[PDB]
C-alpha cells in the first residue's frame, strides 16, 4: 500500500536508511579458522538482514510464510552482493570485514572456495568498471530479496516495477540518455544472474562442509531450506 | 523455526 | 559486424537462426521407469545440443570469439538454453512440459525420476509466467541469445568488452520490439526488467538441474553421450 | 574436446 505510494526519491532514501551496518569479524591460519570466521560473520549478518528486510517497502505487506520463503531463498545472494559492494574499491581483494580483507590466495585455504572467490572478485571488478553507485546497489539488493523466491504474487511484482522505476530515475538523474538508461538497467540485472549462480554454487559447498565447523542453529535452518 | 520468530517482531 | 545491425535485422537474423523442434525416441509399448524416462530426456538433449552449437554460431558476434571462449559460453549456458526453449514451447500447454511433440509430460510423470518433479514445477511456473506476460517469439530469441552471451562472461579483457557491446545491442533490440508493440516508455523498462529477472530463475533451475544430473550419472541410471559427459564435466564439480 | 571439434565442423 504505502510502498506503492512512495516517490522515486522516497524509495531511495527509505532503502538508504534501511542499510545494515558493516560488521567486524572476531579475527586476530587453518581451514577451520577460515570457515569459522566466515560463518560467525555470516550468522551475525543474517540477524541484521532479517530486520533490514522488514524495512524494505512492501515486504511487511506479505504473509510471514512468504517473508520466510523469500529470505530462505535469497539470504546468500544478499550476503554476496553486500560483499562485492564493499570490495569494490579493493581490486583483487574481498572485504568480508574492515579487519578481514582477503585476496584469492587466502581462498585456497578452504577446498573449493577459491572458485567462488574468483567469481565474487570478477563481480566486484564488474561493479567497479560500471561505476556502480550506492543508490543503485540498494535497489539491486531489494530486487534480489523480492525476486529470488517469487494477490501476493502481483503485489511483489508491483513493488518490483517500482524499484525498476527507481533505478531508471537514478540513471536519468545522472544525466544518462534514454538508450543509455535501458542498457545500464539491463547490465545491472544480468549481474543478478551471476549472483544467483554464485549463491547456488556456494550453497552447494556449504551443505557439504556442514562436519567442519560449528554452524549456528539459524544458519543450519537457512542451509536446510535449500535441501 | 528460528527465522519465523525473528521476523515476527 | 554485429554492431552494424539494425534492430529489425537483429530480430530477423535471430529468428532465422532458430533450431528445429526435434522428436523424442518415446516408445509407448513399455511403461515408464526412472531409467527409461531419463533415457528419453538424455537422448533428446544430446541431439538438441548439436543443433544448439550450430545456432550459437549464427548468433551475431559469437563467431568473433576464440574457440576457447565459444566453448566456455556454451559449457556454461547449455542447460539454461535447453530449459528456456522448453518453457517457451510449453507456453500453450498449461500444466504440461512439451519436451517434444510426442513427449508432453505433467508433474506426476516427473515423479518417475527422483528429484525431478521439483525442477518440473519450476519449469511449469516459468512457462506460466511467460504465458501471463504474453512473451513474443521475437522477445524469446533475444532472451535466449542473452543467456548464451551473458552466463559465462563473468568467468573469463579485449573481447570481454565485445560481448557486452553485443549484449547492449540485444537490449536495444528488445526495447525496439516493445516500442513497436505500442508499449509506453515506462512499460518498456518495466517489461525489460521483468524478462531479465526471469533469467535469474532460469539460471537457478539450471544449477539445480545440473546438480541432479551429476547424481544420475554417479548412480549410473543411463548412459550419457561423450559430449553430454563433457558438458556436465564443465560445471561439474565442485562439492 | 568434442565441443571444440563441433564448433569447427
Ligand atoms: O565462499 S563460499 O561460497 O563458501 C564456500 C565455498 C566453497 C568452499 C568453502 C566455502 F566456505 C561463501 C560465500 C562467501 O564466502 C563464503 C561465505 C559464507 C557464508 C556463510 C557461511 O556459512 C559460510 C561462508 C561468504 C560470505 C559472504 C558474505 C558475507 O558477508 C559473509 C560471508
Ligand atoms: O529435470 S532436470 O533439471 O534434470 C534432472 C534429471 C533427473 C533428476 C532430476 C533432475 F533435475 C532436466 C531439465 C529438463 O528436464 C531434465 C532435462 C534433461 C536435460 C539433459 C539431460 O542429460 C537430462 C535431462 C531437461 C531438458 C530440458 C530441455 C530440453 O530440451 C531437454 C531436456
Author numbering:
A (entry chain B): 305 to 332, 337 to 458, 470 to 529, 532 to 548
B (entry chain D), D (entry chain C): 688 to 696
C (entry chain A): 306 to 461, 469 to 551
Could you share sentences copied from the article?
ERα contains structurally conserved globular domains of the nuclear receptor superfamily, including a DNA‐binding domain (DBD) that is connected by a flexible hinge region to the ligand‐binding domain (LBD), as well as unstructured AB and F domains at its amino and carboxyl termini, respectively. The LBD contains a ligand‐dependent coactivator‐binding site called activation function‐2 (AF‐2). AF‐2 binds the signature LxxLL motif peptides of coactivators such as NCOA1/2/3 (also known as SRC‐1/2/3). In the canonical model of the ERα signaling pathway, E2‐bound ERα forms a homodimer that binds DNA at estrogen‐response elements (EREs), recruits NCOA1/2/3 (Metivier et al, 2003; Johnson & O'Malley, 2012), and activates the GREB1 gene, which is required for proliferation of ERα‐positive breast cancer cells (Ghosh et al, 2000; Rae et al, 2005; Deschenes et al, 2007; Liu et al, 2012; Srinivasan et al, 2013).
To overcome barriers to crystallization of ERα LBD complexes, we developed a conformation‐trapping X‐ray crystallography approach using the ERα‐Y537S mutation (Nettles et al, 2008; Bruning et al, 2010; Srinivasan et al, 2013). Using this approach, we solved 76 ERα LBD structures in the active conformation and bound to ligands studied here. Based on our original OBHS structure, the OBHS, OBHS‐N, and triaryl‐ethylene compounds were modified with h11‐directed pendant groups (Zheng et al, 2012; Zhu et al, 2012; Liao et al, 2014). OBHS analogs showed an average L‐Luc ERα‐ΔAB activity of 3.2% ± 3 (mean + SEM) relative to E2. Despite this nearly complete lack of activity, the pattern of L‐Luc ERα‐ΔAB activity was still highly correlated with the E‐Luc activity and GREB1 expression, demonstrating that very small AF‐2 activities can be amplified by AF‐1 to produce robust signals. The average induction of GREB1 by cluster 1 ligands showed greater variance, with a range between ~25 and ~75% for OBHS and a range from full agonist to inverse agonist for the others in cluster 1. GREB1 levels induced by OBHS analogs were determined by recruitment of NCOA1 but not NCOA2/3, suggesting that there may be alternate or preferential use of these coactivators by different classes.
